[PDB]
């Protein structure tokens, strides 16, 4: 459970993301795919994209990045009180998309990289630590759900 201060650092940098949710989403998904190319394979929709420029030009990828960040933003705003938001996400990601926790780690890493790249002044050690805790909590709670649904374990 994060402190209120930590939550406020998370939400402070997130407001920056909200200024251009699509461009942030693009940067994060591109980062994910560059750093962990195996992930691009569960997006049957994108899995054919080969260059950075192709990724930037893809409407579908741009849409997807907004979908991810919109959901995650709503989650972070709940300050850990996010059971109702995680429920449908766990369902689809455990039972349909089959996204292992390690991939959620990979996308967490990409979020952290992009937020530090674009907003370093709002993403010092203090804020990085808070975001890391928030994303860890999301992972921890979604993993418990996954198991309830019969995934992983
Ligand atoms: C912060 C992490 C994530 C959030 C908040 C998130 C959220 C979403 C939401 C809201 C949707 C659409 C509704 C639904 O199907 O549940 C979705 C779809 C999907 N997501 Fe995620 N997601 C994340 C991580 C991932 C990761 C890491 C992968 C793969 C490596 C992934 C792959 C999938 C796929 C394949 C779809 C369906 C896309 C399509 O229609 O072509 N997600 N996600």
Curated annotation (Swiss-Prot):
InterPro entries the UniProt entry points to: Globin, Globin-like_sf, Myoglobin
Keywords of this entry: Cytoplasm, Heme, Iron, Metal-binding, Muscle protein, Oxidoreductase, Oxygen transport, Phosphoprotein, Transport
EC numbers on record: 1.7.-.-, 1.11.1.-
Catalytic activity: Fe(III)-heme b-[protein] + nitric oxide + H2O = Fe(II)-heme b-[protein] + nitrite + 2 H(+); H2O2 + AH2 = A + 2 H2O
Positions of modified residues (Phosphothreonine): 67
Annotated residues for binding of O2: 64
Pfam families, per the entry: Globin
Annotated Globin domain residues: 1-147
Subcellular location: Cytoplasm, Sarcoplasm
Binding site for heme b: 93
Family according to the record: Belongs to the globin family.
Record text on subunit structure and interactions: Monomeric.
Function: Monomeric heme protein which primary function is to store oxygen and facilitate its diffusion within muscle tissues. Reversibly binds oxygen through a pentacoordinated heme iron and enables its timely and efficient release as needed during periods of heightened demand. Depending on the oxidative conditions of tissues and cells, and in addition to its ability to bind oxygen, it also has a nitrite reductase activity whereby it regulates the production of bioactive nitric oxide.
Protein name per Swiss-Prot or TrEMBL: Myoglobin
Origin species: Physeter macrocephalus (Sperm whale)
């Amino acid at each position: 459970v994060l402190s209120e201060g930590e939550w406020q650092l998370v939400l402070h940098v997130w407001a920056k993301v909200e200024a251009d949710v699509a461009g942030h989403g693009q940067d994060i998904l591109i980062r994910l795919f560059k750093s962990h190319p195996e992930t691009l394979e569960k997006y049957d929709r994108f899995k054919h994209l080969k260059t950075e420029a192709e990724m930037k030009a893809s409407e579908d990828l741009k849409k997807d990045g907004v979908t991810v960040l919109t959901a995650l933003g709503a989650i972070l705003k709940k300050k850990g009180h996010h059971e109702a938001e995680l429920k449908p996400l766990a369902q689809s990601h455990a039972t349909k998309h089959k996204i292992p926790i390690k991939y959620l780690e990979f996308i967490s890493e990409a979020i952290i990289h992009v937020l530090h790249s674009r907003h370093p002044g709002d993403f010092g050690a203090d804020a990085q630590g808070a975001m890391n805790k928030a994303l860890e909590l999301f992972r921890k709670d979604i993993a418990a759900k996954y198991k309830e649904l019969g995934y992983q374990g």
